[PDB]
């Protein structure tokens, strides 16, 4: 069984995220700066590549 | 290390290090088995690695049947002459060091084994147990 | 061997160009100092932006070439070749020399040390002072959002801090915009090839009627 609404729920915490380009840290999808002090809150972000 | 061994063997006193020579037991035309290293063989400086009864060694043939000479093959040692302790108390040792050629997966290359075979080796590899005349 | 650009950055020695005393000099890495709409009038592009410097140091020849490439592979892709007049202002005229001592360099087993340290030329340089235009770009006024970005991409190809200043002059001329309005209202200013010719109130009178048919 699938329950395809639940796959939309599971993507909220794993697939609907953003990754920083410098420190590879997982970030909110509505990010604007990284929440770390190692990259330096850089404004060079990227979306998370999904499946297939 | 000993890939293809069935279970576990205990600590048997390391009697034959590298450079040793075992009289080959099987009838596959080899006679000597010059040990070049052992599967296992932890690392400590200037300690040359030693084999015990039942280990899989890597050996080269030094005498007989030139099809098998001059290259590396794995070998299973089936008799050692260093007196090791069985956990039921008795100490025992055979009268020659002896080894049986095999592949990595434990398939012994020969057809039968002359002389006795130690229980600690015959219990570990099944195909040295289905070819052994005497299990000690 | 390409010695780094921090080795020949500052202005330590006095100018040393190619001359009759400097016969053996290799050429620069720049050969074209003007691309874009080179054959454009002064009238079509009324906006000029400057890429000026903030410090006194030397600009390498291949550095200016690589930045000339980077500014020109931006505006030709986001605005096309028609709508910019790029003009590299500074020329590489200095000659940088190098003291080679490689393990087979002109001589025997060991070449020498600091005895006879005069070095053969290897590269060119372009001396730029505090406030000197490097990349003048002429284009239209409403296309100015590209050349702010396009010369921002050229800033990262040579050292120093370099300001991106717009100029109130009518493009590549030396006078302001409201002067050029009155000089386009009145016919005082006559179009040359890619430049323009101004009124000379001083001169022979008949040459000011042989020229300027629209004035009077």
């Amino acid at each position: 069984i699938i329950e395809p609404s639940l796959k939309a729920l599971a993507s909220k915490y794993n697939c609907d995220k953003s990754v920083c380009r410098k420190c590879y840290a997982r970030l909110p999808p509505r990010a604007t700066n990284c929440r770390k002090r190692k990259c330096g809150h850089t404004n060079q972000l990227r979306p998370k590549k999904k499946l297939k | 290390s000993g890939n293809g061994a069935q279970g576990t063997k205990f600590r048997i006193s390391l009697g034959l290090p590298v450079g040793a020579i075992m009289n080959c037991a099987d009838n596959s035309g080899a006679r000597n088995l010059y040990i070049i290293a052992v599967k296992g063989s932890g690392s400590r400086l200037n300690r040359l690695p030693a084999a015990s009864l039942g280990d899989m060694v890597m050996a080269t043939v030094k005498k007989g049947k030139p099809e098998l000479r001059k290259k590396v093959m794995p070998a299973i040692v089936v008799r050692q002459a260093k007196s090791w302790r069985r956990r039921d108390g008795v100490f025992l040792y055979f009268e020659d060091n002896a080894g049986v050629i095999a592949n990595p997966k434990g398939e012994m290359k020969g057809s039968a084994i002359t002389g006795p075979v130690g229980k600690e080796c015959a219990d570990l590899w099944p195909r040295v147990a289905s070819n052994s005349g005497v299990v000690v | 061997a390409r010695r780094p650009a921090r080795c020949y950055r500052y202005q330590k020695n006095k100018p040393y160009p190619k001359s009759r005393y400097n016969r053996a000099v290799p050429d620069s890495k720049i050969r074209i100092y003007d691309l874009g709409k080179k054959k454009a009038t002064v009238d079509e592009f009324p906006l000029c932006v400057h890429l000026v410097s903030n410090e006194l140091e030397q600009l390498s020849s291949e550095a200016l070439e690589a930045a000339r490439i980077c500014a020109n592979k931006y505006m030709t892709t986001v605005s096309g070749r028609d709508a910019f007049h790029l003009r590299v202002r500074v020329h590489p005229f200095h000659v940088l020399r190098i003291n080679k001592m490689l393990s087979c360099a002109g001589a025997d087993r060991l070449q020498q040390g600091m005895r006879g340290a005069w070095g053969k030329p290897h590269g060119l340089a372009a001396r730029v002072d505090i406030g000197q235009i490097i990349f003048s770009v002429r284009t239209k006024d409403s296309n100015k959002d590209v050349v702010v970005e396009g010369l921002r991409r050229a800033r990262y190809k040579f050292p120093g801090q370099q300001k991106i200043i717009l100029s109130k002059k009518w493009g590549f001329t030396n006078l302001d915009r409201p002067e050029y309005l009155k000089k386009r209202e009145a016919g005082e200013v006559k179009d040359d090839g890619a430049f323009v010719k101004f009124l000379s109130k001083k001169g022979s009178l008949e040459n000011n009627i042989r020229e300027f048919p629209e004035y009077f």
Partner: protein
């Protein structure tokens, strides 16, 4: 720079009592009693009325004024969990291996355990935080509804099951198995 006056207003609902002395906020009401301690903030409360509390600050910077509206929201979450309450609906997602969640009362308290998570043989213990009752939705076979009168001890316990039911050494976009939260509602609604 330093703002000369910054106030917020906490609307106190009906039947709800609030007790504050030296930045300790004790809230009692129709269901439950919450006591949160706020000594780490320079904040002045004042009883301007019996229905609404003014909360203010004086000569605070951008750091300090930002930490004023987080105080009004922390009291507002206290009285909201005291009038209505808080409930968190969580949901089981699994590809093949079924997750089997129970509730066991060991030597200390109501541990929550999960078993057969992705075929695993290790139980995954997670205690309840007190004040939080644990509830299963009987009608839907793959659902769990946490509930309690504080939003903190519910949501920390709701995130506890999300942290403990994670995957290891596999693609998380393929192996999307776990126990996630979907609904953060109130009790009387």
């Amino acid at each position: 720079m330093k703002y000369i006056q910054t106030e917020q207003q906490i609307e106190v609902p009906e039947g709800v009592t609030v007790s504050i002395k030296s930045r300790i906020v004790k809230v009692v009401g129709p269901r439950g009693t919450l006591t949160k301690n706020l000594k780490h903030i320079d904040v002045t409360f004042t009883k301007v009325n019996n229905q609404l509390i003014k909360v203010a600050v004086h000569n605070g910077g951008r750091k300090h004024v930002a930490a004023l509206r987080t105080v009004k929201s922390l009291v507002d979450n206290m009285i909201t969990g005291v009038t209505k309450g808080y409930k968190y609906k969580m949901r089981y997602v699994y590809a093949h291996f079924p997750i089997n969640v129970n509730i066991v009362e060991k030597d200390g308290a109501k541990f929550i355990e999960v078993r057969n998570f992705l075929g695993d043989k290790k139980i995954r213990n997670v205690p309840v935080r007190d004040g939080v009752t644990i509830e299963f939705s009987t009608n839907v076979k793959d659902e769990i509804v946490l509930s309690g009168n504080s939003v903190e001890d519910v949501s920390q316990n709701a995130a506890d099951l999300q942290q403990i039911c994670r995957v290891r050494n596999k693609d998380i976009r393929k192996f999307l198995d776990g126990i996630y939260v979907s609904h953060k509602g109130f009790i009387t609604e």
